[PDB]
Symmetry: C2
């Protein structure tokens, strides 16, 4: 088995947590909690930072015996490798790379605004540019069922999560693009995914950590 | 010939101008210039932007004839691939995934600082944690000549970029881990790298865009 560490928050973990589930990967949940109050006690994880012997201390981090890795993309990729959930042809592979970094780019964009007390100040600015943003995901998906082609890849996990984030932030987004709404259908109707969705250990929210103005819980 | 387009700023393309330089890739430079005044004008880009046909119109971008690869990382993966400077062995693949992203993490982290209003307030905090972050980089290289191991991969260029960045910022941050220093000197000593460095196309500064509280020019 393998263990995955992070907080009991969705965060950058929700993508990996999806990937491991879809591939019947027998994993273990390593979640650390931080206090509320004025000084968000982030100890739980801190006292175990060094004890894991990670190259670069941080979470999410994956454990698979002589395999302990950090950095979100490194983890997703690695699980994808033993499943071929990466590109095959040069075209597929480049579309995977673009989308890879692009997904994380927009996740971060939304994060920055949500991790800023000036929330409502920047909130509209994001909401106004957002339509053009969503527009392109459809421009990319377009013809194929899965963002890269007819085959499912790890990037299709990144795409789902980032789509659901905005969906809850402002539901009135994907509607203008039935293309993007369709995607969130296949990637929900999947036997193993519906299973995980309707399971006891299904973690949707909190979106952001206690230190978030919005999405915190 | 492939076209490389980015602002007249070194920025993120700095690693790319080295990589395609090293791989003898027949490139051409499309520099877009930023304006000043209260509204730092970027019309040159805005006007072109959508015309180029990038699935996700962003700068820097690469148009290898019939290939419009956007986003630095995806660009790096693209060039490296065609010149096999990628992780060959599974253990190397993990090193490549970790380093690439980690180097990208710290670069944007410094980018968070130089792009935030209160530079001189947040700066001491970065210096406050700078050494420890650097430590880990030293660990990773360890005894190897190149971060991944015996061979040179794209992640070396990336690393060299992020390392040099911190050398102009704080000349003594790297002055604690000689292991990292030698790596740099080795990198610069590479025949087709020294030539570029003392060539009319070498772009070492401006570091940040013409709006950054630090690094702009």
């Amino acid at each position: 088995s393998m263990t995955l560490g992070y907080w009991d928050i969705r965060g950058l973990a929700h993508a990996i947590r999806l990937l491991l589930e879809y591939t019947d990967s027998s994993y273990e949940e390593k979640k650390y909690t931080m206090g509320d109050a004025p000084d968000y006690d982030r100890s739980q994880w801190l006292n175990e930072k060094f004890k894991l012997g990670l190259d670069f201390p941080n979470l999410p981090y994956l454990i698979d015996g002589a395999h302990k890795i950090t950095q979100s993309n490194a983890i997703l990729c690695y699980i994808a490798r033993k499943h071929n959930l990466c590109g095959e042809t040069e075209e597929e592979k480049i579309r995977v790379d673009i989308l890879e970094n692009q997904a994380m780019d927009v996740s971060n964009q939304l994060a920055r605004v949500c991790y800023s007390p000036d929330f409502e100040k920047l909130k509209p600015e994001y909401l106004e540019e957002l339509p053009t943003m969503m527009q392109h995901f459809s421009q990319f998906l377009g013809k194929r069922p899965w963002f890269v082609g007819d085959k499912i890849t790890f990037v299709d996990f990144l795409a789902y999560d980032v789509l659901d984030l905005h969906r809850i932030f402002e539901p009135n987004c994907l509607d203008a693009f039935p293309n993007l709404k369709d995607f969130i259908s296949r990637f929900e109707g999947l036997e193993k995914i519906s299973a995980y969705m309707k399971s006891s250990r299904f973690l949707p929210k909190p979106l952001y950590t206690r230190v978030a103005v919005w999405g915190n819980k």
